[PDB]
Homo-oligomer: A and B are copies of this chain.
Amino acid sequence: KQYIISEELISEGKWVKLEKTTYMDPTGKTRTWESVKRTTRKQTADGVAVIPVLQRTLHYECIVLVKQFRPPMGGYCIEFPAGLIDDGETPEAAALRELEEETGYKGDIAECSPAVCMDPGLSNCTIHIVTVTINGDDAENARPKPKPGDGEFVEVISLPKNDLLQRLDALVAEEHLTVDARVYSYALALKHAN
């Protein structure tokens, strides 16, 4: 019933662009919407977010998270390991690559989501949420070495799965950090499931 009529370019940067989307509402009236987009997409989605489950025997299962300075936020944020998918790359391969680059861990694919939207009121940005198990007992994951690219500066924070929300709340309280919405939504559901 609703559909895109046309798109006007307001201001295109190098990486980000701002468009004025004109769309048909379900009654019949025409309405406008300043939509946001990325220029880097070719591709199933823009990027991937890795839910990395660190499994070590006789230890609590941990979720591997990344702390980075984020200039749009103007501060540090706790997030799932993540990054854009390169040209000629399946979402599963981008997940294992980004996981190793940012954390140093070599993981195995458990499952992969379809394209899911990030902030659909604001932007068109999508990701594949990729669940990855990491064998922490394997010798390749004994001394994990992050391989950061030019510009990335990532700090690894592994928190136990069984108390993820409470440990995230503790980090917000004593270090002024902004936890990611998807990380928080995941941590909430872990507690709510019971």
Contact = CB atoms under 8 A, between A and B. Distances in A.
Contacts of A4: 71, 74
A109 interface: no
Contacts of A26: 69, 153
Q: Which of A4, A20, A21, A34 has the most CB of B within 10 A?
A: A34
Interface residues on A, range: 35 or more
A66 B187 CA distance: 22
A159 interface: no
Given A16-B34, A179-B114, A192 B190 contact: yes
Contacts of A122: 16, 36, 38, 72, 118-119, 123, 125
A15 to B, nearest CB: 5
A73 B124 contact: yes
Interface of A: 1-4, 10-11, 13-16, 18, 20-21, 23, 25-26, 31, 33-38, 49, 51, 53, 69-74, 76-77, 79, 82, 113-127, 129, 131, 151, 153, 161, 169, 172, 178-190, 192-194
What are the nearest 10 A-B pairs in CB distance?
A: A189-B189, A11-B11, A193-B193, A2-B69, A33-B71, A35-B72, A70-B120, A182-B185, A116-B181, A186-B189
